[PDB]
Amino acid sequence: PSRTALSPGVLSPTRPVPNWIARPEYVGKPAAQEGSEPWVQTPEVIEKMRVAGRIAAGALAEAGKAVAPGVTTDELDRIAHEYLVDNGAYPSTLGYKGFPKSCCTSLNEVICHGIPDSTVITDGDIVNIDVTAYIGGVHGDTNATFPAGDVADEHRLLVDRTREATMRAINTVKPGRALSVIGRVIESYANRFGYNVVRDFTGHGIGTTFHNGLVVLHYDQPAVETIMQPGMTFTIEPMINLGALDYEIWDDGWTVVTKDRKWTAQFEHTLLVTDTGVEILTCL
Ligand SMILES: Nc1nnc(SCc2ccc(Cl)cc2Cl)[nH]1
Ligand code: NI
Numbered sequence: 001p002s003r004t005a006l007s008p009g010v011l012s013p014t015r016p017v018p019n020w021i022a023r024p025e026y027v028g029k030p031a032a033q034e035g036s037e038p039w040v041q042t043p044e045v046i047e048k049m050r051v052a053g054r055i056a057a058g059a060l061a062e063a064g065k066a067v068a069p070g071v072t073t074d075e076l077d078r079i080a081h082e083y084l085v086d087n088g089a090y091p092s093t094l095g096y097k098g099f100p101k102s103c104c105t106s107l108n109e110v111i112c113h114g115i116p117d118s119t120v121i122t123d124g125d126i127v128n129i130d131v132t133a134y135i136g137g138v139h140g141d142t143n144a145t146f147p148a149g150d151v152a153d154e155h156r157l158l159v160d161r162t163r164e165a166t167m168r169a170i171n172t173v174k175p176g177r178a179l180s181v182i183g184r185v186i187e188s189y190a191n192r193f194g195y196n197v198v199r200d201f202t203g204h205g206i207g208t209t210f211h212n213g214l215v216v217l218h219y220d221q222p223a224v225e226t227i228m229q230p231g232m233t234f235t236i237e238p239m240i241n242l243g244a245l246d247y248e249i250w251d252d253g254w255t256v257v258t259k260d261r262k263w264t265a266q267f268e269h270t271l272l273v274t275d276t277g278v279e280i281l282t283c284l
């Protein structure tokens, strides 16, 4: 038997960031300046994104190494926040549209955007940690779902197959390919097991802004005409559900949960289309 449905807990005090670490423009504003930026990056921006992506991948790995029964999601946040700040990176989530922490921690039926708090992880949970770094004027964005103790087969297989669907999608990226191949491959793979791929949340172009207006669907929609070109930077980040797609948002305005409380898993990397293929920027 696995735990029952989650409820929100209490947040820790806001974690400070030294002032010499530049803030993204949206910190202190109610919305963000994003969605109309070019999709192909310059070489200088790409080089900076490799830095941001490695630092994000570091923070995710350190926080993920900490996932175990008994640890709170706030403890994961303090680990991610300190790794980012000690690397001179601003945690991009902190202050985005008022988001109060430095990463998102999404257990079990939480599709995305969970807020680190007093929630205690327990045996059988699956814990998504999403870490984003802003450094060098650019963002890196990455996430993974980590098992806590012995996870029930249904849930273990959801996590492993979601990781596999993400890697199969990443491996289709190449110049000249329709962007829509990504959601074709993910949805085809998920459909093997009767999983449902989330539609209303998507991958995104990312560069000097976090959601730059490029949208990467994770479901099949071949009418999209966008082609992958060298220098494009964007994420692949499917959320795959055991249950139905219907969801609710908690009163905090962030936490998105499945309406039927069946569990859901996600993995995410920031990618660069190269002249021949793809480079994952959010690798160690
Ligand atoms: N689409 C998406 N990728 N990773 C997330 S975690 C939330 C988040 C992280 C950073 C920033 Cl600047 C904005 C947001 Cl919404 N969401
Ligand atoms: Ni993310």
Ligand code: NI
Pocket (backbone or CB within 6 Å): 141, 203, 204, 235, 237, 268
């Ligand atoms: Ni993302």
